[PDB]
């Protein structure tokens, strides 16, 4: 089973850090901000094997490259950046519009990353919940430089959302 996951969000939000942590179980803090690519991994989600494809985007034009490809989305902002949070809402609007225009119904997970920087929070967890509420998507706060298991969970949950 092949599952396409696309990761969207404003530059700086930690899209690649989250991807590399998922893939490698390590935090890599400087990763080419311009590099966009699809990363392949063999996963097991609910005792079921998956060929997972993770598209780590770097933005704007030809959004269909992910809009007509992904089976689920992660939309990422940083909890220490209002700017990032605001940009996250635009990606969710795009997902909504595309679904409306094409009938393509794809689940999304809203991610407030850099939970390790919670002391400099510009966005509350309650506000992330509210934003997810406006788009009917799931919501998680995560970090690329805490443990691996919580990052694995969100990626595997996108898989579960894609299978439902
Ligand atoms: N403190 C902290 N910094 C992070 C985290 N994730 C990414 N970063 C940093 O945020 C910046 C952008 O990360 P990057 O993965 O390039 O984000 P991208 O542009 O969305 O792909 C870099 O300085 C990363 O080191 C995180 O979870 N916690
Ligand atoms: Mg990146
Ligand atoms: Mg490639």
Curated annotation (Swiss-Prot):
One of its GO terms (molecular function) is GTPase activity. It comes from the Eukaryota. Its EC number is 3.6.5.2. The keyword Disulfide bond does not apply. GO terms for cellular component: plasma membrane. Keywords: GTP-binding, Hydrolase, Nucleotide-binding. GTP binds at residues 9-16, 56-59, 113-116. It catalyses: GTP + H2O = GDP + phosphate + H(+). Belongs to the small GTPase superfamily. Ras family. This is Ras-like protein family member 12. The gene is RASL12. The chain holds residues 19 to 185 of 266 of the full protein.
């Amino acid at each position: 089973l092949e599952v396409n996951l696309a990761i969207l969000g404003r530059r700086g939000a930690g899209k690649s850090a989250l991807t590399v942590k998922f893939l490698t179980k390590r935090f890599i803090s400087e990763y080419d901000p311009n590099l966009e690519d699809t990363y392949s991994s063999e996963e097991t989600v609910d005792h079921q094997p998956v060929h997972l494809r993770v598209m780590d985007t770097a933005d704007p034009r030809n959004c269909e490259r992910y809009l007509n490809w992904a089976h689920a989305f992660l939309v990422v902002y940083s909890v220490d950046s209002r700017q990032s949070f605001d940009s996250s809402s635009s990606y969710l609007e795009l997902l909504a519009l595309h679904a409306k225009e094409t009938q393509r119904s794809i689940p999304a997970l809203l991610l407030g990353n850099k939970l390790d920087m919670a002391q400099y929070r510009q966005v509350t967890k309650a506000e992330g919940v509210a934003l997810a509420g406006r788009f009917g998507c799931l919501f998680f706060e995560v970090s690329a430089c805490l443990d691996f298991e919580h990052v694995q969970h969100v990626f595997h949950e996108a898989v579960r959302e894609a299978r439902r």
